[PDB]
Design a protein around this motif. Structure first.
Motif, short mmCIF file in Angstrom:
data_model
loop_
_atom_site.label_atom_id
_atom_site.label_comp_id
_atom_site.label_asym_id
_atom_site.label_seq_id
_atom_site.Cartn_x
_atom_site.Cartn_y
_atom_site.Cartn_z
N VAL D 1 0.83 -1.20 0.00
CA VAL D 1 0.00 0.00 0.00
C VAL D 1 0.86 1.26 0.00
O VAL D 1 0.50 2.27 -0.61
CB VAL D 1 -0.96 0.00 1.20
N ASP D 2 2.00 1.21 0.68
CA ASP D 2 2.85 2.39 0.85
C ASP D 2 3.75 2.56 -0.37
O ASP D 2 4.96 2.33 -0.35
CB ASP D 2 3.67 2.28 2.13
N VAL D 3 3.13 3.00 -1.46
CA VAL D 3 3.82 3.14 -2.74
C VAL D 3 3.94 4.62 -3.10
O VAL D 3 3.05 5.42 -2.75
CB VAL D 3 3.09 2.37 -3.85
N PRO D 4 5.00 5.04 -3.79
CA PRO D 4 5.09 6.44 -4.22
C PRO D 4 3.97 6.81 -5.17
O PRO D 4 3.57 6.02 -6.03
CB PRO D 4 6.46 6.52 -4.90
N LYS D 5 3.47 8.03 -5.02
CA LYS D 5 2.36 8.51 -5.84
C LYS D 5 2.84 9.01 -7.20
O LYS D 5 2.37 8.54 -8.24
CB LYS D 5 1.61 9.62 -5.10
N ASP D 6 3.77 9.96 -7.21
CA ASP D 6 4.36 10.47 -8.44
C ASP D 6 5.88 10.41 -8.32
O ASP D 6 6.45 10.70 -7.26
CB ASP D 6 3.91 11.90 -8.73
N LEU D 7 6.53 10.03 -9.42
CA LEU D 7 7.98 9.87 -9.46
C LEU D 7 8.58 10.95 -10.36
O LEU D 7 8.09 11.18 -11.46
CB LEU D 7 8.36 8.48 -9.97
N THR D 8 9.64 11.59 -9.87
CA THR D 8 10.37 12.56 -10.67
C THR D 8 11.29 11.83 -11.64
O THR D 8 12.13 11.03 -11.22
CB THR D 8 11.17 13.51 -9.77
N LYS D 9 11.12 12.09 -12.93
CA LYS D 9 11.96 11.43 -13.92
C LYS D 9 13.19 12.28 -14.22
O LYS D 9 13.11 13.51 -14.20
CB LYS D 9 11.19 11.18 -15.22
N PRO D 10 14.34 11.66 -14.50
CA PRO D 10 15.52 12.45 -14.87
C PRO D 10 15.26 13.24 -16.15
O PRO D 10 14.62 12.77 -17.08
CB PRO D 10 16.61 11.39 -15.06
N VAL D 11 15.78 14.47 -16.18
CA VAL D 11 15.53 15.38 -17.29
C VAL D 11 16.45 15.02 -18.44
O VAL D 11 17.68 15.09 -18.32
CB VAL D 11 15.73 16.84 -16.85
N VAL D 12 15.86 14.65 -19.57
CA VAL D 12 16.59 14.39 -20.81
C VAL D 12 16.23 15.51 -21.78
O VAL D 12 15.08 15.62 -22.22
CB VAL D 12 16.25 13.01 -21.40
N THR D 13 17.22 16.33 -22.13
CA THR D 13 17.02 17.49 -22.98
C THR D 13 17.40 17.15 -24.42
O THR D 13 18.48 16.61 -24.66
CB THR D 13 17.84 18.67 -22.49
N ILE D 14 16.51 17.46 -25.35
CA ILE D 14 16.80 17.30 -26.77
C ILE D 14 17.55 18.54 -27.25
O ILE D 14 17.02 19.65 -27.21
CB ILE D 14 15.52 17.08 -27.59
N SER D 15 18.79 18.35 -27.68
CA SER D 15 19.64 19.45 -28.10
C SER D 15 19.34 19.86 -29.53
O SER D 15 18.57 19.21 -30.25
CB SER D 15 21.11 19.06 -27.95
N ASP D 16 19.96 20.96 -29.96
CA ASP D 16 19.89 21.41 -31.34
C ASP D 16 21.06 20.91 -32.18
O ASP D 16 21.03 21.05 -33.40
CB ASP D 16 19.85 22.94 -31.40
N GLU D 17 22.09 20.34 -31.55
CA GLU D 17 23.25 19.82 -32.24
C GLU D 17 22.96 18.42 -32.79
O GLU D 17 22.32 17.62 -32.11
CB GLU D 17 24.45 19.76 -31.30
N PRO D 18 23.41 18.10 -34.00
CA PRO D 18 23.18 16.74 -34.52
C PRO D 18 23.94 15.71 -33.70
O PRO D 18 24.96 15.99 -33.08
CB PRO D 18 23.71 16.82 -35.95
N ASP D 19 23.42 14.48 -33.72
CA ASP D 19 23.98 13.40 -32.93
C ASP D 19 25.05 12.66 -33.72
O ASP D 19 25.11 12.72 -34.95
CB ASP D 19 22.87 12.43 -32.50
N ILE D 20 25.91 11.96 -32.98
CA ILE D 20 26.97 11.15 -33.58
C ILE D 20 26.37 9.86 -34.11
O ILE D 20 25.44 9.29 -33.53
CB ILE D 20 28.08 10.88 -32.55
N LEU D 21 26.92 9.38 -35.23
CA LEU D 21 26.51 8.11 -35.83
C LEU D 21 27.67 7.13 -35.74
O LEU D 21 28.76 7.40 -36.26
CB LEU D 21 26.09 8.31 -37.29
N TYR D 22 27.44 6.01 -35.07
CA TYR D 22 28.44 4.96 -34.93
C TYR D 22 28.11 3.82 -35.88
O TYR D 22 27.04 3.22 -35.79
CB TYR D 22 28.50 4.45 -33.49
N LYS D 23 29.03 3.54 -36.80
CA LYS D 23 28.86 2.39 -37.69
C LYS D 23 28.95 1.09 -36.91
O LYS D 23 28.21 0.14 -37.18
CB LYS D 23 29.91 2.43 -38.80
N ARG D 24 29.86 1.02 -35.94
CA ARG D 24 30.07 -0.19 -35.16
C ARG D 24 30.56 0.17 -33.77
O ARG D 24 31.26 1.18 -33.58
CB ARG D 24 31.08 -1.13 -35.82
N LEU D 25 30.20 -0.66 -32.79
CA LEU D 25 30.80 -0.65 -31.47
C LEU D 25 31.25 -2.06 -31.15
O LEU D 25 30.42 -2.96 -31.02
CB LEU D 25 29.82 -0.15 -30.40
N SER D 26 32.55 -2.26 -31.04
CA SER D 26 33.14 -3.56 -30.75
C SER D 26 33.52 -3.57 -29.27
O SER D 26 34.55 -3.01 -28.88
CB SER D 26 34.34 -3.82 -31.64
#
Ligand SMILES: [Mg+2]
Ligand SMILES: [Mg+2]
Lengths: 100, 66, 196, 138, 101, 132, 154, 131
Positions: D1-26
């Motif tokens: 019964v003793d459960v949190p009502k509302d949870l604060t989510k971490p803020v993820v901001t969408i930037s104006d700079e383009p993102d990096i593209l990785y062809k592969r991650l080894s």
């Protein structure tokens, strides 16, 4: 053993890739090697070879006097030294040894 | 190390309860959770590279242990 | 009277509990918190593997109790908001090569210890196909003689590896500088080239 | 019964700079224990599938370094003790992922790197030609 | 509080070698080439020969960091064979085991 | 005859733990390592520094919890974290264990410049594997 | 043809840990996380729940007292990146000259007695003390009431 | 509300202490393991992930051309002769050294400049003119 074209092309590639441009013999090329790396005496494996034995010994000696560390070995040495006094085998005073 | 019958009866009660806990951890149906699933779950949760298999973690029915 | 230890709290756990709340993060094995009759240890003759209480062998294991399939699926559901979508137009490797002819390789090293430093992380490798560059017959011939072994005729790829600067951003800027001076010198024609 | 009502989510901001593209991650992990690499593989693969990352796995050949030492403190040269260090490998190959997806996945699996396991992650980034190279000066 | 007087002498040699490393490097570069005049290189020979003896790196010895044993040391762990085995045989060295094949 | 790390047979009255009961040739076969770090993997550095730290931590804990340790320490390193898992007895009062935990974790964090944690598992007595 | 590259997402250095923390709830069978998770060391009452934490905090105070009393034992910095919060603290003034710049140091360290003495001597000598510094001395005296703040041990 | 703030306001003892009373109203013990990692990350004790082997180390904001092009520092040496040839090998080696900062590389070059000035008489005997 290179043509004038190959020789001039190799000097051009040396200037672009930041190599030695003047003709340098093998002996003089040791100067380049000497300044391209750290001397052995400056490598961390060399000057930090040993752990600071002064720090460890002094810290643990202080913690023992503070009552927070029990040095079983030191307690053993203390008991042996105490029983040697009762046995008459005590360390002489400097300058007052058996030879005076 | 002698083992009485009352001791084995207690070991079997613990294995049945622990078997339902393990199925709950892995998100599987406790009813259809077989011994092969137990061995697979234990190998994942407690990975041991010891060359001798008899020295690795094990959660078997008491009748197969004692 | 001496202090009597409480019974283990596994006796209070329900078989339908939320296990991720018990082991939320990586922690050592705790017999009083893991409700499993797990045993470990090479048994003695006519013996059994040692119980979990006071079992040092179970303590040596890097357990995955905090990474059960149930926990992983809940973790990944919360991490989706941090991800971005790969461009749909870049469906194949050949299509990536068309729009992005340059490839930059770098390596990060994760070790255990107080220092995060690693001299191998400064290295940068730049690969590019000469077919992607605007090179005529003369420029492509001169560029191949300047780079030497950095060019592979089989693959037609030019590999520039830079690691003479302390930082990786410096070795990256230097790799782009090298590609720029090599491209402009290949297009330049000297008078001594007539003696080929 | 003793459960949190509302949870604060971490803020993820969408930037104006383009993102990096990785062809592969080894992702190459190294360890002394094969079973630990098996558990880590299962965890890393399941994490990649939930996030929608295409991943392949293979096992590079192990390496065993051996050396010899005298057994006695004094003399008895013909009696030695030999030791070894076994390095086992597991390579996770991820393809076609952006820089933001790579930062989240790597942070998630790097924090959960078991004790005694090292990682060498090689990232292949996709870049466009510098503007100075697109045409000759003259 | 070092193991013995011989370790203490090596500690001082490593300290002095670190302090003169840059100076010795610069003077040696003048000597290791055929470009500079002999008159200048002969002066550089005298200069590096006048530096303190314990600044020379060839006098540093890799001793066991726990027992000061001057030989039988494994460079990777900086331990003598005897001390290394004591720790390895008690399972205190991560990933090290007896080799059978 | 070999001696290294072998508890020799007696009259059947010497209790030995699981770790003490296995000779060196059982390492990686029937018993694991007491310390886990990446220093001894191929291509990894700083094995010498990790080793000195381990030797000190074992002596520090032995003298900081005198007569309390019921088994060898298990040292774990992840990133720059240092976890120390110890099996102790139930003779000291809990207040003194909490004091020594808060004291040792803080002192070691400042000594080795890294977050150190100490996990204690209590046992009523030294767990006996066999009587040699 | 043209490809649209997605926009970059940014977050704080603890955002990922905070996202994972949002997936777990409190464990009802356990005592608070600050206590040692062990049946013998877990608090069995509200009195022990208070005293166990005070004993642990007392041990941390003793460690800090030793670190600040013998700082030379804790000056070897092997951490990369540097961790300023794991270095010894120096509560003593290092400027021994009698001047304004030396008084400002004893005001930052909150040395009520030394700062007043440094102020008197500096004043008797006839040297000028700025107004901003005279106010910074009143803020220290007016706050603690001309008494030395609490310390670990003298 | 105050449209323009006093960014350069001095942190008086009354203001620094009132800010600590506001950090005590939200002072609670860590509730789980994630919060301990979050706390250590904010304090700087725990590494930040994903791992960056260069975290907290920028070589004085130097650009690559400051490490690789050192001929600007040889303007005080002769333009030709053996001293120029020798210093071109020194700077060539220094431009390939990733273990030295630009400040340390200049220290090497500055040392040779002073050394050849003290040896001017010896260099003049060999028909070499160093300034
Ligand atoms: Mg020698
Ligand atoms: Mg034999």
């Amino acid at each position: 053993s290179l043509s004038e074209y190959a020789f001039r092309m190799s000097r051009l590639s040396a200037r672009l890739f930041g190599e030695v441009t003047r003709p340098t013999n093998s002996k003089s090329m040791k100067v380049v090697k000497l300044f391209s790396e750290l001397p052995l005496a400056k490598k961390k494996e060399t000057y930090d070879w040993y752990p600071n034995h002064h720090t460890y010994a002094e810290l643990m000696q202080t913690l023992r006097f503070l009552g927070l560390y029990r040095d079983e070995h030191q307690d053993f040495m203390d008991e042996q030294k105490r029983l040697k006094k009762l046995r008459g085998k005590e360390k002489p005073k400097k300058g007052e040894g058996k030879r005076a | 190390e002698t083992y009485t019958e009352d001791f084995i009866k207690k070991q079997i009660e613990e294995f049945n309860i622990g078997k339902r806990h393990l199925a709950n951890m892995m998100g599987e149906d406790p009813e259809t959770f077989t011994q092969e699933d137990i061995d697979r779950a234990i190998a994942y949760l407690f990975p041991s590279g010891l060359f001798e298999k008899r020295a690795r973690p094990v959660m078997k029915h008491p009748e197969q242990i004692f | 009277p001496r202090r009597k230890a409480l019974p283990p709290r596994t006796e209070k756990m329900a078989v339908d509990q939320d296990w991720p709340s018990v082991y939320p993060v990586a922690a050592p094995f705790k017999p009083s918190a893991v409700p499993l009759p797990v045993r470990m240890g090479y048994p003695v003759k006519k013996g059994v593997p040692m119980a979990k209480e006071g079992n040092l062998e179970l303590l040596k294991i890097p357990n995955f109790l905090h990474l059960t399939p149930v926990a992983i699926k809940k973790h990944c559901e919360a991490l989706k908001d941090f991800c971005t979508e790969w461009p749909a137009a870049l469906d194949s490797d050949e299509k990536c090569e068309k729009h992005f002819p340059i490839e930059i390789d770098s390596t990060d090293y994760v070790s255990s210890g107080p220092s995060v430093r690693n001299p191998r992380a400064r290295v940068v490798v730049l690969r590019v196909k000469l077919s992607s560059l605007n090179l005529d017959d003369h420029a492509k011939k001169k560029l191949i003689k300047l780079v030497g072994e950095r060019y592979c005729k089989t693959t037609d790829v030019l590999t520039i590896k830079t690691d003479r600067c302390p930082l990786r951003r410096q070795n990256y800027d230097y790799a782009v500088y090298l590609l720029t001076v090599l491209y402009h010198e290949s297009w330049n024609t000297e008078e001594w080239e007539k003696s080929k | 019964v003793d459960v949190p009502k509302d949870l604060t989510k971490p803020v993820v901001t969408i930037s104006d700079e383009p993102d990096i593209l990785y062809k592969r991650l080894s992702v190459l992990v190294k360890g002394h224990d094969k079973a630990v690499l098996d558990s880590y593989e299962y965890f890393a693969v399941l994490a990649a599938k939930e996030l929608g990352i295409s991943i392949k796995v293979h096992e590079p050949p192990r390496k065993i370094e051996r050396f010899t030492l005298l057994q006695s403190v004094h003399i008895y040269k013909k009696h030695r003790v030999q030791y070894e260090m076994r390095t086992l490998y597991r390579c996770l190959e991820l393809e076609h992922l952006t820089g933001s997806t790579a930062d989240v996945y790597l942070e998630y699996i790097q924090r959960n790197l078991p004790e005694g396991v090292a990682m060498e992650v090689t990232k292949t980034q996709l870049e466009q030609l510098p503007e100075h190279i697109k045409e000759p000066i003259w | 509080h070092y193991v013995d007087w011989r370790m203490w002498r090596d500690v001082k040699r490593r300290k002095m070698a670190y302090e003169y490393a840059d100076e010795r490097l610069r003077i040696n570069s003048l000597r290791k080439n055929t470009i500079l005049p002999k008159i200048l290189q002969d002066v550089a020979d005298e200069e590096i020969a006048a530096l303190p003896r314990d600044s020379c790196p060839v006098r540093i010895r890799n001793r066991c960091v726990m027992t000061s044993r001057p030989r039988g040391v494994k460079r990777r762990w900086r331990l003598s064979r005897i001390v290394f085995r004591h720790l390895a045989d008690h399972g205190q060295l991560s990933g090290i085991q007896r080799a059978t094949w | 005859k070999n001696r290294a790390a072998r508890v020799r047979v007696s009259k059947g009255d010497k209790p030995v733990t699981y770790e003490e009961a296995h000779a060196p040739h059982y390492i990686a076969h029937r018993k694991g390592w007491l310390s886990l770090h990446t220093g001894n993997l191929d291509g990894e550095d700083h094995a010498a520094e990790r080793t000195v730290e381990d030797v000190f931590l074992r002596k520090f804990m032995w003298g900081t919890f005198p007569g309390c340790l019921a088994d060898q320490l298990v040292l774990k390193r992840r990133g720059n974290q240092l976890e120390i898992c110890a099996v102790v007895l139930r003779q000291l009062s809990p207040h003194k264990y909490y004091f020594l935990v808060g004291y040792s974790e803080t002192l070691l964090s400042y000594f080795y410049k890294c977050p150190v944690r100490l996990h204690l598992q209590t046992v009523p007595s030294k767990v006996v594997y066999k009587y040699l | 043809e043209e490809v649209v590259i997605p926009k970059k997402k940014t977050w704080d250095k603890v955002a990922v840990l905070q996202a994972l923390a949002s997936t777990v709830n409190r464990d009802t069978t356990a005592v608070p996380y600050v206590f040692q998770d062990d049946p013998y060391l877990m608090p069995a009452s509200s009195l022990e729940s208070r005293s166990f934490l005070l004993a642990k905090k007392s041990g941390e105070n003793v460690a800090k007292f030793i670190i600040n009393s013998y700082p030379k034992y804790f000056q070897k910095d092997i951490a990369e990146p540097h961790i300023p919060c794991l270095m010894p603290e120096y509560f003593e003034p290092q400027i021994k000259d009698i001047s304004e710049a030396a008084l400002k140091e004893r005001i930052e360290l909150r040395k009520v007695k030394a700062s007043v003495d440094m102020f008197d001597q500096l004043l008797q000598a006839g040297t000028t003390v700025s107004l901003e510094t005279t106010n910074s001395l009143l803020d220290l005296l007016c706050y603690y009431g001309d008494q030395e703040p609490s310390t670990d041990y003298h | 509300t105050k449209e323009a703030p006093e960014t350069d306001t001095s942190p008086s003892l009354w203001d620094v202490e009132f800010a600590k009373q506001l950090a005590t109203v939200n002072e609670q013990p860590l509730q789980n393991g994630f919060e301990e990692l979050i706390q250590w990350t904010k304090e700087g004790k725990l590494w930040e992930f994903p791992i960056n082997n260069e975290a907290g180390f920028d070589d004085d904001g130097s650009e690559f051309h400051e490490h690789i092009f050192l001929e600007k520092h040889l303007e005080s040496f002769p333009k030709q002769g053996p001293i120029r040839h020798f210093m071109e090998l020194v700077t060539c080696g220094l431009s390939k050294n990733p273990y030295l900062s630009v400040k340390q590389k200049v220290e090497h070059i500055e040392w040779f400049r002073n050394y050849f000035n003290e040896k001017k008489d010896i260099l003049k005997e060999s028909n070499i003119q160093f300034n």
